[PDB]
């Protein structure tokens, strides 16, 4: 009982996009597809929905005329296409079963994991890893805390580890933010005893497979 | 004293044993004599609920009809996965027969008789018998045929109005005749349909005035399906073995719902023969052989029109409505609505 | 469109207790509404079908109740991998929404502030960062003062999810100006107002 939907897509203003859900362990032609999307700060919205015997849709008021959702009854998989993208397309779409099945009650599951359509005009660029060095700035008794700014990159997403992974504790790895110059940015920070400092070496992991970017960031205090 | 139940059913016919067409062959060995005496017991005081979207007597006629197209009609190649199988395809004889469905000893099947019966809530005249009425499994999208009209008032049915997933059933109390033709003797695939369109656009605007009191007076608006294959975006059905495909889009003219000149006269709906089509069975495809020699010509009473309902928002102003079709439960339930089995306890 | 709402907007419990989420409806449908539970980063995940029915695999610690108008959706002993949003939905109708997290005990959240590194101002951007460690609730408000003077418009913040663990919130606000204007003030304040805090607490810096 699984839907495996393609990698998340980025795609310039007015282009289109095509995006597909894999089914898994249903018999495929005995339940209908819904579509959503989830744009950030947004709620769940209704694209359309999909009866893989015929093909028979049933599109959103709002998407008919840039809408098209389609099947393969054989490869057991949908799709859905999208034209016109325009900024407030960029979101999260998913699609869903209704596990009722021929009686219609809008029972879904199970879900995608969801594809991330991003459509922006900015092009691929690799992070700029910043030190957040550690100061006099003491809380708590000794701990102190140190960090890396990703800023400037794009597309999402990127990926921190401290330590090659070795360590964990204390460590908070913000949800990235958009700025208004179109790149995104992330704060990743890690509380350590003050003791600690000098001794023990602390680098930040940074990793940015959408432009094959690796970067090992030392954070030291600042004289 | 009953309660509701579901049992294995069995079917009747009139069908000879000798006739070669394939429901008369089915019916033969799959079903029983018609009961020359049939009995029906009124019910006073009687006051039963029956929901035409739980009814299992749905899904049993479904299953026979299913059974009947897998053994009657034998496509050259079948495109079921990614194997393919080829075999003998020699053209058949086509025309459905009724059928009546009947209980086993031990259960009986309630009817309701009210007029004005959507299909759901309670029924304050209802009766019991053995066997339902003659039923045609004729198989089609968009539009019903050859089935029962509605007495009265034309009537909407629907589980839920809400429901926009939900196929809507739209029940005719007059019969409107629709004349396909392949002509002889040079397209041997090119066919067209005929339809009364005084007639058609009559009934097409009362059932407007019907969908508008079940939508707060709002505009009610028709358009093409939104997408699909070609057999519910376009009226498809089965005449004399050949798969029928007709474009309905003069059929759902608002304009003619809306006195004037174009829309009193003979319609004619521009039609196709395909020989690979896409089964409704959910199974695949299936290529047949092309079409036969000499006139192909099939009349069909429409009875009744399925239909589909936008959703999404910014209106307010209007409804859409578009032709719909696809699952055949849908067509046995236009027929079905007003039985339920029942055991007696 | 089918009128949707859930109250309260946002749910605090301790683990093991018992919570319950309303659901109004704007017109009658009987028991045709479903719960969703939402996670960020995670596809929706059907709790409750068909008003009462639970759906298969989910635990018998949620349960869902309601008709025509009413509905509540109540989870027996609250769980820390139950923090989410959860929805109650009709078709394609979504309701707002009610976030729910673990309750603990208040929690005063430890300031750091972070002046802009060497290699960014020589880019010709300068980025402050205040960082917010370990908190409960997670209502808090951080100011930026520069010189003295309230700013906003040019700052973004993020919070992280609840931990399993402590049941705390950690908070990145980042101030975002140029060279030019970074070069011009002197003091950089990042003011913090939280439950926790008798008085907001003020870490700040002078540049250079
Ligand atoms: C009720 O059903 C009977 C058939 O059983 C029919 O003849 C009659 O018109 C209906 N009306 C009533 C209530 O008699
Ligand atoms: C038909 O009438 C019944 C009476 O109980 C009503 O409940 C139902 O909503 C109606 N069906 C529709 C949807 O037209
Ligand atoms: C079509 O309707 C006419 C009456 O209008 C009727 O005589 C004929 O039997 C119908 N055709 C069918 C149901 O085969
Ligand atoms: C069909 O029903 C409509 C109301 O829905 C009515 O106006 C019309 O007269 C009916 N036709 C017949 C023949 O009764
Ligand atoms: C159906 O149409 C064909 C072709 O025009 C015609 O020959 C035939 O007479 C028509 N049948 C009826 C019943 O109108
Ligand atoms: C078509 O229907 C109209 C209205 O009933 C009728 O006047 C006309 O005679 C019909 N045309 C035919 C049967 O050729
Ligand atoms: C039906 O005919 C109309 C008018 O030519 C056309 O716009 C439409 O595409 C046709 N429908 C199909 C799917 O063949
Ligand atoms: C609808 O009917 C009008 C009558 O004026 C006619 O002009 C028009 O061609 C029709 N539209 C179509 C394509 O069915
Ligand atoms: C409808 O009924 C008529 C008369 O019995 C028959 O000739 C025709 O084949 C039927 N139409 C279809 C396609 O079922
Ligand atoms: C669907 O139909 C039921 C009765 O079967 C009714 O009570 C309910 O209001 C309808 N649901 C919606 C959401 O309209």
Known sequence: QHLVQSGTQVKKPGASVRVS??????????????????????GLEWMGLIKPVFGAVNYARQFQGRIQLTRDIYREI???????????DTAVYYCARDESGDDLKWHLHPWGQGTQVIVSPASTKGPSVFPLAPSSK???????????????????????SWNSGALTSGVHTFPAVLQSSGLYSLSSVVTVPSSSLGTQTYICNVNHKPSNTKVDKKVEPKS | VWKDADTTLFCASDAKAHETEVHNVWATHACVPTDPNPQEIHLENVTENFNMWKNNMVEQMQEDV?????????????????????????????????????????????????????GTGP???????????????????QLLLNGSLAEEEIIIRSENLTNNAKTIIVH??????????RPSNGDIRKAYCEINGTKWNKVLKQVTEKLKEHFNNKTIIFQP??????????????????????????LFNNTCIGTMKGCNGTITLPCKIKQIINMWQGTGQAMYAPPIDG???????????????????????????????????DNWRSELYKYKVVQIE | DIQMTQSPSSLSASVGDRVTINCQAGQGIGSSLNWYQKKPGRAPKLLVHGASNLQRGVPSRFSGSGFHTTFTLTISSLQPDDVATYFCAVFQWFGPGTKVDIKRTVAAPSVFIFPPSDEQLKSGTASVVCLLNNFYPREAKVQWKVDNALQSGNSQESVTEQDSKDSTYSLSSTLTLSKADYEKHKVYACEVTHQGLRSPVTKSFNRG
């Open chain 2, 225 to 250: 399906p939104s997408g699909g294959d070609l057999e519910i975006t376009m009226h498809s059905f089965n005449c004399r073995g050949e798969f029928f495909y007709c474009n309905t889009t003069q």
């Open chain 1, 21 to 42: 859900c894999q089914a898994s362990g249903y018999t495929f032609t005995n339940y209908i597809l819904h579509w959503w999307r989830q744009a950030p700060g947004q």
């Open chain 2, 123 to 141: 029924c304050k005249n209802v009766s019991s018998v053995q066997c339902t009425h003659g039923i045609k499994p004729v198989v089609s999208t």
């Open chain 1, 78 to 88: 949908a799709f859905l296409d999208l034209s016109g993208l325009r900024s407030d």
């Open chain 1, 138 to 160: 003491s809380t708590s008794g000794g701990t102190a805390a140190l960090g890396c700014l990703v800023k400037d990159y794009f597309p999402e997403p990127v990926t921190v």
């Open chain 2, 295 to 329: 006139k192909i010509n099939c009349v069909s009473n429409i009875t009744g029109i399925l239909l589909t309902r936008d959703g999404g928002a910014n209106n307010t102003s209007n409804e859409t409505f578009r032709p719909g079709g696809g699952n055949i439960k």
């Open chain 2, 172 to 181: 005719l109390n007059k019969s409107v005749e629709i004349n396909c033709t």
């Open chain 2, 66 to 118: 299913i059974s009947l197209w897998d053994q009657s009609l034998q496509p050259c190649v079948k495109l079921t996965g990614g194997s393919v199988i080829k075999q003998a395809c020699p053209k058949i004889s086509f025309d459905p027969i009724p059928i009546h469905y009947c209980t086993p000893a031990g259960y009986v099947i309630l009817k309701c008789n009210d007029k004005n019966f959507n």
